[PDB]
Symmetry: D2
Subunit: 118 residues, 4 copies
């Protein structure tokens, strides 16, 4: 159910596969920031979630370097899948750049993404 | 210099291998009962100008014994030198129902040291 | 633009007055559910269609309840017909040190005038 | 306890007064970023915290406008005061800049400061 192709509000594309032991792998395509083309993502998810109507906790990372570009940045997404009519992944993310120690205070962006398969 | 074992101040320990393909893999020890698979990515080609190396990993807090129905992501950067550290901000997201989704997510920071 | 009554999607409601010198003052909503708010905004935003930087704080104490916590919202006002306040918030509950790593929740809210 | 002069790890100066009512008032001066001289802050704190040795939840905002400069941004600190031989305010902060709709994805920095007497 998590496996498949997803989109967010910004129009990025995130092609995950959810493996057996809570492994998340795929590519990420973002509509924004220092980034063109596909980046490798990997993460993890809760492979044994709750029956009680609770969602499925997951997260992934993307290092924004590929064969064409290196932003010297990395983003992590934290959130939960929710199945149903409109299945969706509500996330919060943290994007950190490689900064000198004098710029580390301003090294990290925070934001939230919502993914859907539409 | 990311490869190796790292300690935070909370008593948590992580062992990670920094692969040549920007891969970050290892275990997180929050007692095998407490070890969790870690997976992430890092800037395999950092600047040499005094910048740290951006990185992120994730841990889903399920293993063969427990499941907290949650996941933590770390996003931060490796800083070399004789006093090396990984400085991070994390997001802990819990499995909740929709009416509880506002209370799904803890934020924090950790520093990691080679010790 | 900001001054007035804002509603989020959780039904919850706040009324604020932005004073000329970036003050934000109002209440966050049932008497028992009303709390004092205070914040600050950029009283002189760019004129480039950037929104208006602002934030505020609610400590969750009133004469009826005390949750021993504070929420702060950091976001920006985006005016016009359909105005929105898009925020991010940190909720921190007083904790012992031992539990301080789990002291602070994060999320986001979007408040509208309707 | 909370009332006083505070500094963070950045060499920033946080000068705050806590009201009986739960109001925070004061001035912040940051060592870093698009800032010089003092800025107005306002906040709230729990004016009747727990008895369990829990910290005092609190928060404040600085919109970064003063007569010297304007960064079109606001930082919200959220945290707790911790009494003791080493009084300390541990916080997480959100710095949101006014951005266009297009750049809103990168409007908000997150970070953490701890303030010492
Ligand atoms: O460093 C860069 O400029 C590249 C960052 C990638 C864009 C971010 S990651 C969080 C958010 N979600 C997206 O789909 N895009 C942005
Ligand atoms: O937008 C700007 O450049 C002004 C922001 C002020 C710098 C920040 S606020 C969070 C952090 N704590 C400090 O003492 N300084 C920085």
């Amino acid at each position: 159910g998590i496996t498949g192709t997803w989109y967010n509000q910004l129009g990025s594309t995130f092609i995950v596969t959810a493996g057996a032991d809570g492994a998340l792998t795929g590519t990420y395509e973002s509509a924004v920031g220092n980034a063109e083309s596909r980046y490798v993502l990997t993460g993890r998810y809760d492979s044994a979630p709750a029956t009680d109507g609770s969602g499925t906790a997951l997260g992934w990372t993307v290092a924004w370097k590929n064969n064409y570009r290196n932003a010297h940045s990395a983003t992590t997404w934290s959130g939960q899948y929710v199945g149903g009519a409109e299945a969706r992944i509500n996330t919060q993310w943290l994007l950190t750049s490689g900064t000198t120690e004098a710029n580390a205070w301003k090294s990290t962006l925070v934001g939230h993404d919502t993914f859907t398969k539409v």
